Design a protein around this ligand. Structure first.
Ligand SMILES: [Ca+2]
Length: 223
């Protein structure tokens, strides 16, 4: 997250880190046995780390649980990033408490202008690199389809939204991928793609979760 602030410890209790030796992408817990993330973050072995704030220190709130099943959307397209969404089933259920909690799926899609909270342990610099140990937060609004499609002509499908700022300076980046965009208590976005991070006139683009509630529910019931 570029241009953000350090979240209060354990204030984002549905955020997960996906780990394969080290943190590589984010995710959100949506029920006790299932995490949702981005399909472009796919790898064959993943450990899910819940209850994290500082990813470099063991703090005593953490649960580390191995993924048992990894399911990418059947129509994910690696060229356009359409349908960039993946579900992970945990090998044993997470135990829900004050530091580990689910986030609701969306009851409807969101209005332009809606304010949201984006979080993750991705890159924090817009020139260079630096990955933080402490979770970072950023508040940003859903952009109208007009501002989003003008930024990326021909590249925005019906399953994508833009959230962020056209002046640059504040955005998600590498390592935030798969993490949550939560607006009025509902998971509306998954960090997906963009041109660079925090560039003027190039806001982040996010998978539009309100189109996938049926797929998520049907996949959970079947597995
Ligand atoms: Ca920790």
């Amino acid at each position: 997250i570029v241009g953000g602030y350090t979240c209060a410890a354990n204030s984002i209790p549905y955020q997960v880190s996906l780990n394969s030796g080290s943190h590589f992408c984010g995710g959100s817990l949506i029920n006790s046995q299932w995490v949702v993330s981005a399909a472009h973050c796919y790898k064959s072995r993943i450990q899910v780390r819940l209850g994290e704030h500082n990813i470099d220190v063991l703090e005593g709130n953490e649960q580390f649980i191995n993924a048992a099943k990894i399911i990418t959307h059947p129509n994910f397209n690696g060229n356009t990033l359409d349908n960039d969404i993946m579900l992970i089933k945990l090998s044993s259920p997470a135990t829900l408490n004050s530091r580990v909690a689910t986030v609701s799926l969306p009851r409807s899609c969101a209005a332009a202008g809606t304010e949201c909270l984006i979080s993750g342990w991705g890159n924090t610099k817009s020139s260079g690199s630096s990955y933080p140990s402490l979770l970072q937060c950023l508040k940003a609004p859903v952009l109208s389809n007009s501002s989003c499609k003008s930024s990326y002509p021909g590249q925005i499908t019906g399953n994508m939204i833009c959230v962020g700022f056209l002046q640059g300076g504040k955005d998600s980046c590498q390592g935030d991928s798969g993490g949550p965009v939560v607006c009025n208590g509902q998971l509306q976005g998954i960090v997906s793609w963009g041109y660079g991070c925090a560039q003027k006139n190039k806001p982040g683009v996010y998978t539009k979760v309100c189109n996938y509630v049926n797929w998520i529910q049907q996949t959970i019931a079947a597995n």
